[PDB]
From a paper:
The Ser/Thr protein kinase Tor is a hub for cellular homeostatic regulation. While some yeast species such as Saccharomyces cerevisiae have two genes that encode Tor1 and Tor2 proteins, mammalian cells have a single gene encoding mTOR910. Both Tor and mTOR occur in two complexes known as TORC1 and TORC2. Lst8 is a requisite component for both TORC1 and TORC2. PIKKs share a catalytic core consisting of a kinase domain flanked by a helical FAT domain (named after FKBP12 Rapamycin Associated Protein (FRAP)–ATM–TRRAP) at the N-terminus and a short FAT-C domain at its C-terminus.
Focusing on the heterodimer that forms the core of both TORC1 and TORC2, we have determined a 6 Å resolution structure of the full-length Tor–Lst8 complex from the thermotolerant yeast Kluyveromyces marxianus (KmTor). Our structure shows that KmTor–Lst8 forms a dimer of heterodimers, in which the two KmTor subunits embrace each other with their helical solenoids. The Fourier shell correlation plot suggests that the overall resolution of the structure is ∼6 Å, with the highest local resolution (5 Å) corresponding to the FATKIN and the N- and C-terminal regions of the α-solenoid that contact the FATKIN. The structure of each monomer shows an extensive N-terminal helical solenoid with a complex topology that precedes the FATKIN. The N-terminus of KmTor forms a highly curved spiral consisting of about 800 residues arranged into 36 helices (residues 64–837). The spiral is followed by a linker (residues 838–894) that runs along the surface of the FATKIN to connect the spiral to a region that we will refer to as the 'bridge' (residues 895–1169). The bridge is followed by a 32-residue linker that we refer to as the ‘railing' (residues 1170–1201) that folds back and runs over the entire length of the bridge, ending in several helices (Nα52–Nα56) that form a 'cap' (residues 1202–1292), which packs between the N-terminal end of the bridge and the TRD1 of the FATKIN. The largest interface between the two KmTor subunits occurs at the periphery of the dimer and involves a region of the spiral (helices Nα25, Nα27 and Nα29) of one molecule contacting the bridge (helices N\α44, N\α46, N\α48 and N\α50) of the other molecule. The second, smaller interface consists of the HRD domain of one Tor interacting with the HRD of the other, via three helices (α24, α26 and α28) making intermolecular contacts at the center of the dimer. This dimeric arrangement of KmTor places the two active sites facing away from each other, with the two FATKINs resting on a cradle made up of two N-terminal helical solenoids.
Author numbering:
A (entry chain D): 3 to 301
B (entry chain A): 1245 to 1265, 1274 to 1289, 1299 to 1405, 1412 to 1441, 1444 to 1515, 1520 to 1531
C (entry chain A): 785 to 815, 825 to 836, 841 to 866, 884 to 891, 897 to 914, 918 to 935, 942 to 955, 958 to 992, ...
D (entry chain A): 1590 to 1618, 1631 to 1669, 1687 to 1767, 1783 to 1813, 1815 to 2448
Amino acid sequence: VILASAGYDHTIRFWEALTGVCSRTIQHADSQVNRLEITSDKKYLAAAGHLHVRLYDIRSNNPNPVSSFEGHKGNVTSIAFQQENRWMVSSSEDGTIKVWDVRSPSVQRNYKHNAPVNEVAIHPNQGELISCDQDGNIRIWDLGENQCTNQLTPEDNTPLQSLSVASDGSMLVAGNNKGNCYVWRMPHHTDASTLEPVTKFKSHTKYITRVLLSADVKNLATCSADHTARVWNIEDNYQLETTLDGHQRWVWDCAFSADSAYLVTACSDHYVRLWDLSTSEIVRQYGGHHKGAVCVALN
Amino acid sequence: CSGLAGIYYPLARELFNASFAQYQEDLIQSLCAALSSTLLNLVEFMEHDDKPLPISISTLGEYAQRCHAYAKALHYKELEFIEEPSTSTIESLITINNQLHQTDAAIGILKHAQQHHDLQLKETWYEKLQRWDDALNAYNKREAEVTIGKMRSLHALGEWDQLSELAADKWASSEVKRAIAPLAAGAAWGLAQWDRVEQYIEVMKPQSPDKAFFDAILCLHRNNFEKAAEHIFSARDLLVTEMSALYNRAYGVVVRTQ
Amino acid sequence: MPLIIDTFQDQSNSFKRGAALKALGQLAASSYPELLGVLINILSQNIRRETVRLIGILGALDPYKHREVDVALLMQGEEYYPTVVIGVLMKILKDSIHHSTVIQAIMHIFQTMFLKQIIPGFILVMHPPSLLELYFQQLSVLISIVKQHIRPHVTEIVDVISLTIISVIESLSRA
Amino acid sequence: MKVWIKFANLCRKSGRLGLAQKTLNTLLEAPPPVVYAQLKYMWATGSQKEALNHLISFTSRMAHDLGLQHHIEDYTKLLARCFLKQGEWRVSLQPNWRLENPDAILGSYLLATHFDKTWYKAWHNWALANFEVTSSLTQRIKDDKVPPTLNANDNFPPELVQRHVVPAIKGFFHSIALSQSSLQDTLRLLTLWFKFGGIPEAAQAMHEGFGLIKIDNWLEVIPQLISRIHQPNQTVSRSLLSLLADLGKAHPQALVYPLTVAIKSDSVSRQRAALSIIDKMRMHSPKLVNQAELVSDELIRVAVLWHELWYEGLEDASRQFFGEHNTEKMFATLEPLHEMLKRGPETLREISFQNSFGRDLNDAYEWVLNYKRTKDINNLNQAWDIYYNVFRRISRKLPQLQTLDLQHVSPKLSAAKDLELAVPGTYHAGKPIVRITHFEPVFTVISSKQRPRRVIIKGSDGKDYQYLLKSHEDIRQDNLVMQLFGLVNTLLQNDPESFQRHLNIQQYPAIPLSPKTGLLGWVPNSDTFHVLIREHREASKIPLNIEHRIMLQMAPDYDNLTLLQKVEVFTYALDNTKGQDLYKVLWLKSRSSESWLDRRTTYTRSLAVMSMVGYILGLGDRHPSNLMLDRITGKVVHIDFGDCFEAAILREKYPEKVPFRLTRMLTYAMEVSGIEGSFRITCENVMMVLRDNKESLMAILEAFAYDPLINWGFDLPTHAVMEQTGIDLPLANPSELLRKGVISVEDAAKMELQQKAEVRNARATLVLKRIADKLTGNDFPRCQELSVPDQVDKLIQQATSVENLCQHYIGWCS
């Protein structure tokens, strides 16, 4: 249950389990980190502030040089290391999704879009996935093959911040420029998933950023840079559950990893105050970023 | 001594700076000086002072500005409304630009106000009706005085019949004088009927330029040049004074006179 | 009334526009319901504009700037502000009571003890014998600085009239 | 009636209520015009075939009446009849006229036109209807040329002809010139003609008409005239160039400039033609031709600091060499520097003064010449070293070069005290053309990458005309710019109570100089946005950039800033900031305090016209540097227009697209609720634009942007050609077609350039496409027209949104 976050302060450090005291050497420096992801075994952890993916070993203590992944040019908006953690999905600001697989760290993927690739996703089958850019309708993409699309458009205008799929095997959900998050019900498929739209639901109606279903996805969470975040109970009708206490902040990270009890947060405030997912709290409220952050990870 | 006013005023400002260079003395002194109420002379001097740097007395400045009535103040007051979102002061500003007759864009800002911060009611309907808007709006809202205003829109509109409804109101409530007068004027315009017109003008006013026009209009409506001549010369003189006050505004208006 | 029957025979516009405006102004000015019946008989946008053109020919420039004036300075404008004051004083000065300007320039240099001075060069050049005396002394004041460009004008005034002997003597002294 | 009927047409222009009211009233009352009236009320209703019905009904009515007082009544009624024919014609043409029906339609037009003797300035536009019939035909010929799978297209258009149809509308186009369109449709049909062809019909007809019309007509677009330089078919086009020099001969010195410029630029064959026209000039009033020649040549003489230009250019050249190993390629440029060296110490204490250094460097260059011409290395050293030292020396001089004077550089300039025709681009057709008092030899060297030295040259009128160096710039592009701006200002002159609201774009004259060069001028007393701002804000005793300040403060870089990161950043900073300082500059300029008001309206309208202008033409130049206003009671100066196409689309650096550019609280605090009515006023205006001439003149100016090498240059640069750079990259063949099927590619050559230029026509097509979208109109996921309210609204959004806008890098100056 290793814990760390990444700021615009360009430097990151691993917070202890319940201590939240961040100790490690992780430098986004020369950049920020866009997303934050470790490996399946938490071997290496890669992120991109600008134009280049950079892995620093999650298994090794403050290794600088885990891997370096060039890719579709931009800060990778989001990326996915598969269960295989060999073939690995990656999506970049470049406008087209180019996945860096972990293979050497070998990267081959091409998924075109009408805007920056918002997130690299995976379906109920890890080898199955779809791509929804900051443009428009999701594009179905499989693993190292058979990838073109199946178009799913929650809206004809609003930029889709990411393509968001957890493990359900029936579900859909996202977050976007909307602030009211359009979610759908997928069918049971590896990837087929004819959508059954749930709704666009505003928790924070202004620029809802981080969209994450709960561990059992019984709950749900939407973080915003509006310093406004309200959890929902996805179990019943995504019923709004917990307003997330935060300062003026940007949270691209809203999660509870080993808990769904205490709620880890992301604050541009330069000190991230983690709440209690159950009710609320301040759980080891702090940050490694001097300036502030939106990011987080788990191992 | 040669005494030169402008010479003084700026120099007086330099001195005012030296004072500004406790001046609580100066503070109260100048304060009451403003309170004195020539006027616009030192007023403008103060304006100059502010322009260099603030002399404060903010809404005091606003007040005395209003007192100037010169409508250049509308700028100062603008700065005032520029400060906060006072729907009242906003309205004040609206009518202020109305006075300025720069008010087109201001009406923009009015529709903006109804759009931006809450909305008003009275001046809201009034100005929105000054705008091509508010018409069906004032119609329903009055269906929901202001009705006399909507009637004025009906005058601005067609339907002298609608004006006949307003005329039913005129018979109903007959201030009532002023109300009926402009209204029934509009009616007789629409309705060629000389009788309702007779009622109208009869009901109109001791000084009634429009109903002077109506007076002569009636004299003409049948025969007499004479009373019509009276009205002619008289109203001519009235409007003469009017223009005498004065385009750049009145061109159209005086053109209407002529 | 002549214009009236004229109207009976025509429409006017033309140059008369400007005239009418003046007339309007005149009507405003001379307002006896003479002017009353008149403008009554006067009997708009385009014409307005063209009239603004003709009046733009009638007046322009300086009065506007005069209305824009000193205050003008500060607008464009401490050290400066004071100097500007000096200039303003000078402005009125050239803008009469001569000896006023005399003492003016006197304490002016005294306080100076510049650009404006150069302008004031021409001012003094504008120029009874008291003038000559005072201005001579003033030249002696000018002996503080060095023309440059005051020189030619200096010669110019020096010519008319060539008493002031000592003054010019001092001019060469300051040369 | 025609009184009250005029009141009725008024009602038509007037809003609905009065419209229908008076309509019914007066309808109730040979009310043929009232027929046309109720008809207009029907157009207000919009019933297609009700209209068409009654239209043809009265048509046949009057037909029977007049067969094939009451007489004159019928003359007028005839004008109105044909008028009707055209009116309904267009009415249906809405649905229609692509290919097909338009034929018949056009006939009716021509029919109506045949019947005219007329309103036909109206039917000028309907002669421009017929001309647009020649267009759709040409478009149908463009359809045939596109689907052809220039004798080919010639014969294609011929055999009916659409050219036969065309010549008619051409003579009637001349007739239209006679009517007023105006210069717009003039140049329109003009280039339409030159491009149409030189054939016998065309030749004779146009010979007559052009011969039959006017000179000063042709005087405008003279730049666009030059835009035709080498006529691929001399033909009657040769003779048309003859006509060109002919009209030219009339008041040549009234302009003559284009002559000078074309002369300056090397058009090769067309430059030879330029020499021909030069002879014409060297013929007609040859003296002034000489004097002028001297003038222009002297301008070109001033130009860049010579050895300095060579120095910086060679710096970039050695940059080119050392980097990537350009070397000889770059050294070929250095060979031209040697060619510059081959010019020798020409000027007075300029290249003269430059001798020593230049001589030494030249020796070194010669030393660099030798062993680099041996193989590489020795003089490869000597070159870089000598150039390094000389770079240092010339760097020192460059700082010292800030000062400018003619006598100590090229006194030949100073040598001319006065010349007959100066009028430094004054170029008023009728005028008191001014000679020159010239100016001081001392000049003001601008400080820039170009460091575009400037002066203001005292003339015969005693009015110093600010001139400025332009290093590698198209004033032609700019000529076109002020030109279209004059189309604008025409519409302005053509405008409604908007013209009572009137604000028009002041067009800074700028003379082109060389193929890349130009002559600008310092505008009327003005404040560059960036400049003036930075001044006042610093004179507000506060950091020049609170922007980069609040930025770096916010985080390390906006470079890597995500949409989110950048968003919150811009937000936070914005919160910290505000633009009231601008409004306070107004307040600074406010003097007399009615200045605050009036000039507020001024800058307001300024913003408006700007908005219209760009949203039309693109070329934002978000730079507050690129932004400017007036030190006078003031208006905004948007100058130095790069090009039509989106810089966004261009970029490369940053995604900036907004129709306007508004410093937030600057714009806002400028008046009340920011541009609520002001931009609404703008909406009115841009709507008129979007209506009037939006078809004809808009498309005309488009065509102006459309076409050839100078213009094709601006538009290339609009891509740019470097953004037009590589791809797969054949269309189909051209990759594998550069294979051993060559070397005939070296034997043939030619296109090449017709490919790129086809792409030019493509981007142009897309451009105009985006105009039609822009005009009247469409954009965004839906379209409709969206007309005034919407296109204005979405515009306003585009103004409002976003950080995505604000994502503009360093050029937004948020």
